[PDB]
mmCIF file of C-alpha atoms and ligand atoms in Angstrom:
data_model
loop_
_atom_site.group_PDB
_atom_site.id
_atom_site.type_symbol
_atom_site.label_atom_id
_atom_site.label_comp_id
_atom_site.label_asym_id
_atom_site.label_seq_id
_atom_site.Cartn_x
_atom_site.Cartn_y
_atom_site.Cartn_z
ATOM 1 C CA UNK A 5 -0.020 -0.049 0.117
ATOM 2 C CA UNK A 6 1.050 3.416 -0.789
ATOM 3 C CA UNK A 7 0.265 6.391 1.292
ATOM 4 C CA UNK A 8 0.364 9.985 -0.433
ATOM 5 C CA UNK A 9 1.432 12.485 1.821
ATOM 6 C CA UNK A 10 -1.415 14.501 2.143
ATOM 7 C CA UNK A 11 -3.445 11.776 2.973
ATOM 8 C CA UNK A 12 -0.994 10.651 6.161
ATOM 9 C CA UNK A 13 -1.049 15.070 7.008
ATOM 10 C CA UNK A 14 -5.095 14.678 7.225
ATOM 11 C CA UNK A 15 -5.296 11.374 8.766
ATOM 12 C CA UNK A 16 -2.582 12.055 11.623
ATOM 13 C CA UNK A 17 -3.177 15.594 12.490
ATOM 14 C CA UNK A 18 -6.190 15.215 14.909
ATOM 15 C CA UNK A 19 -3.628 12.632 16.628
ATOM 16 C CA UNK A 20 -0.539 15.456 16.908
ATOM 17 C CA UNK A 21 -3.178 18.134 18.228
ATOM 18 C CA UNK A 22 -4.737 16.094 20.642
ATOM 19 C CA UNK A 23 -1.225 15.725 22.174
ATOM 20 C CA UNK A 24 -0.940 19.454 21.950
ATOM 21 C CA UNK A 25 -3.804 20.118 23.684
ATOM 22 C CA UNK A 26 -3.266 18.119 27.080
ATOM 23 C CA UNK A 27 -1.997 21.477 29.326
ATOM 24 C CA UNK A 28 0.253 21.284 31.267
ATOM 25 C CA UNK A 29 1.054 17.845 30.070
ATOM 26 C CA UNK A 30 2.281 19.074 26.393
ATOM 27 C CA UNK A 31 4.362 22.039 27.739
ATOM 28 C CA UNK A 32 7.638 20.050 28.010
ATOM 29 C CA UNK A 33 7.253 18.562 24.835
ATOM 30 C CA UNK A 34 6.566 21.412 22.455
ATOM 31 C CA UNK A 35 9.992 22.781 21.762
ATOM 32 C CA UNK A 36 13.470 20.907 20.733
ATOM 33 C CA UNK A 37 15.352 20.304 23.492
ATOM 34 C CA UNK A 38 17.683 22.940 24.117
ATOM 35 C CA UNK A 39 20.226 21.074 26.392
ATOM 36 C CA UNK A 40 21.899 24.527 28.204
ATOM 37 C CA UNK A 41 19.252 26.532 28.335
ATOM 38 C CA UNK A 42 17.419 24.056 30.182
ATOM 39 C CA UNK A 43 20.259 23.601 32.517
ATOM 40 C CA UNK A 44 20.398 19.648 31.313
ATOM 41 C CA UNK A 45 23.659 20.187 29.545
ATOM 42 C CA UNK A 46 24.169 15.904 30.185
ATOM 43 C CA UNK A 47 21.106 15.618 27.743
ATOM 44 C CA UNK A 48 23.072 14.360 24.592
ATOM 45 C CA UNK A 49 24.907 11.863 26.672
ATOM 46 C CA UNK A 50 21.845 9.777 27.515
ATOM 47 C CA UNK A 51 19.441 10.636 24.281
ATOM 48 C CA UNK A 52 20.754 10.631 20.478
ATOM 49 C CA UNK A 53 17.765 11.353 18.422
ATOM 50 C CA UNK A 54 15.713 14.106 20.008
ATOM 51 C CA UNK A 55 12.334 14.372 19.031
ATOM 52 C CA UNK A 56 9.531 17.081 19.977
ATOM 53 C CA UNK A 57 6.081 18.040 19.017
ATOM 54 C CA UNK A 58 7.094 20.937 16.904
ATOM 55 C CA UNK A 59 9.453 18.960 14.784
ATOM 56 C CA UNK A 60 6.873 16.176 14.129
ATOM 57 C CA UNK A 61 4.229 18.947 13.166
ATOM 58 C CA UNK A 62 6.877 19.973 10.776
ATOM 59 C CA UNK A 63 7.628 16.375 9.352
ATOM 60 C CA UNK A 64 3.816 15.873 8.607
ATOM 61 C CA UNK A 65 3.224 19.035 6.867
ATOM 62 C CA UNK A 66 6.256 18.774 5.016
ATOM 63 C CA UNK A 67 5.743 15.238 3.935
ATOM 64 C CA UNK A 68 8.535 13.356 5.540
ATOM 65 C CA UNK A 69 6.434 10.213 6.642
ATOM 66 C CA UNK A 70 6.100 7.845 3.685
ATOM 67 C CA UNK A 71 3.917 5.452 6.052
ATOM 68 C CA UNK A 72 1.624 6.065 9.083
ATOM 69 C CA UNK A 73 3.911 3.956 11.030
ATOM 70 C CA UNK A 74 7.235 6.328 10.701
ATOM 71 C CA UNK A 75 4.696 9.259 12.349
ATOM 72 C CA UNK A 76 4.148 6.782 15.253
ATOM 73 C CA UNK A 77 7.619 5.891 15.232
ATOM 74 C CA UNK A 78 8.832 9.668 16.063
ATOM 75 C CA UNK A 79 6.231 9.940 18.654
ATOM 76 C CA UNK A 80 7.521 6.994 20.177
ATOM 77 C CA UNK A 81 11.186 8.254 20.126
ATOM 78 C CA UNK A 82 9.904 11.587 21.762
ATOM 79 C CA UNK A 83 8.111 9.476 24.577
ATOM 80 C CA UNK A 84 11.106 6.921 24.837
ATOM 81 C CA UNK A 85 13.734 10.037 25.209
ATOM 82 C CA UNK A 86 11.570 11.863 28.167
ATOM 83 C CA UNK A 87 11.094 8.213 29.854
ATOM 84 C CA UNK A 88 14.988 7.460 29.431
ATOM 85 C CA UNK A 89 16.399 10.747 30.770
ATOM 86 C CA UNK A 90 14.194 11.824 33.261
ATOM 87 C CA UNK A 91 13.176 9.894 36.542
ATOM 88 C CA UNK A 92 10.023 8.090 37.414
ATOM 89 C CA UNK A 93 9.001 10.714 40.111
ATOM 90 C CA UNK A 94 9.861 13.625 37.754
ATOM 91 C CA UNK A 95 7.225 15.794 36.498
ATOM 92 C CA UNK A 96 8.526 15.683 32.615
ATOM 93 C CA UNK A 97 7.941 11.733 33.060
ATOM 94 C CA UNK A 98 4.680 11.929 34.547
ATOM 95 C CA UNK A 99 3.514 14.365 31.831
ATOM 96 C CA UNK A 100 4.928 11.912 29.084
ATOM 97 C CA UNK A 101 2.910 8.903 30.621
ATOM 98 C CA UNK A 102 -0.354 10.999 30.321
ATOM 99 C CA UNK A 103 0.368 11.989 26.847
ATOM 100 C CA UNK A 104 1.081 8.494 25.880
ATOM 101 C CA UNK A 105 -2.459 7.470 27.136
ATOM 102 C CA UNK A 106 -3.594 9.852 25.578
ATOM 103 C CA UNK A 107 -1.927 8.877 22.184
ATOM 104 C CA UNK A 108 -2.942 5.595 22.096
ATOM 105 C CA UNK A 109 -6.731 6.612 22.299
ATOM 106 C CA UNK A 110 -6.009 8.524 19.305
ATOM 107 C CA UNK A 111 -3.716 6.778 16.741
ATOM 108 C CA UNK A 112 -4.896 3.488 17.739
ATOM 109 C CA UNK A 113 -8.430 3.584 15.634
ATOM 110 C CA UNK A 114 -6.559 5.643 12.812
ATOM 111 C CA UNK A 115 -4.061 3.300 12.062
ATOM 112 C CA UNK A 116 -6.738 0.246 11.952
ATOM 113 C CA UNK A 117 -8.641 2.604 9.731
ATOM 114 C CA UNK A 118 -5.814 3.220 7.528
ATOM 115 C CA UNK A 119 -4.775 -0.403 7.194
HETATM 116 C C1 LIG B 201 11.453 16.907 26.807
HETATM 117 C C2 LIG B 201 12.523 18.155 27.614
HETATM 118 C C3 LIG B 201 13.950 17.217 27.523
HETATM 119 C C4 LIG B 201 13.516 16.481 28.910
HETATM 120 O O1 LIG B 201 13.843 15.126 29.142
HETATM 121 N N1 LIG B 201 13.510 16.876 30.611
HETATM 122 C C5 LIG B 201 13.062 18.104 30.584
HETATM 123 C C6 LIG B 201 13.845 18.970 31.623
HETATM 124 C C7 LIG B 201 13.673 20.105 32.435
HETATM 125 C C8 LIG B 201 12.768 20.937 31.171
HETATM 126 C C9 LIG B 201 12.260 20.387 30.332
HETATM 127 C C10 LIG B 201 12.739 19.152 29.992
HETATM 128 N N2 LIG B 201 11.912 18.392 28.550
HETATM 129 C C11 LIG B 201 11.280 21.168 29.898
HETATM 130 C C12 LIG B 201 10.624 21.606 30.114
HETATM 131 C C13 LIG B 201 9.543 22.858 30.159
HETATM 132 C C14 LIG B 201 9.987 24.401 30.010
HETATM 133 C C15 LIG B 201 8.929 24.750 30.952
HETATM 134 N N3 LIG B 201 9.594 26.064 31.505
HETATM 135 C C16 LIG B 201 9.081 27.483 30.885
HETATM 136 C C17 LIG B 201 9.945 28.494 31.367
HETATM 137 C C18 LIG B 201 10.807 28.841 32.520
HETATM 138 C C19 LIG B 201 11.314 27.500 32.963
HETATM 139 C C20 LIG B 201 12.398 27.528 33.684
HETATM 140 C C21 LIG B 201 13.643 26.574 34.573
HETATM 141 C C22 LIG B 201 12.514 25.350 33.836
HETATM 142 C C23 LIG B 201 11.645 25.127 33.046
HETATM 143 C C24 LIG B 201 11.108 26.004 32.635
HETATM 144 O O2 LIG B 201 13.615 24.064 34.313
HETATM 145 C C25 LIG B 201 14.680 23.737 34.493
HETATM 146 C C26 LIG B 201 15.532 22.450 34.758
HETATM 147 N N4 LIG B 201 14.887 21.784 33.408
HETATM 148 C C27 LIG B 201 14.227 20.542 33.297
HETATM 149 O O3 LIG B 201 14.851 19.974 34.394
#
């Protein structure tokens, strides 16, 4: 099966918007990690490939996903980085877990519709 970029954008954008609309839980994830500004300069000793909502938005808007699972992989990358770098007791970790629950509710029916 072939997916045109505008079909992916149409189908997937509501699931990305649902993540943005979690307030305050999306706030750690709305911008690319800047380790010096955030006071976490060792970040890229732990995480290699950063991901955030603004980068996913741009990739969706510019046709950078061939297949819907490439979009899922980037959201999962964003979550994995946060669950790796931050302690289980931390705000960022807990906010990530909230977003992950919302993401399932959004993406699971879409992925099944898209086949
Ligand atoms: C996903 C990304 C990277 C990560 O995996 N862990 C984080 C750690 C800190 C901060 C963030 C993280 N998210 C991003 C946070 C939200 C920014 C909210 N704002 C709003 C403006 C004022 C302010 C001041 C200090 C601050 C956050 C802060 O936090 C200092 C130490 N930062 C983290 O510990």
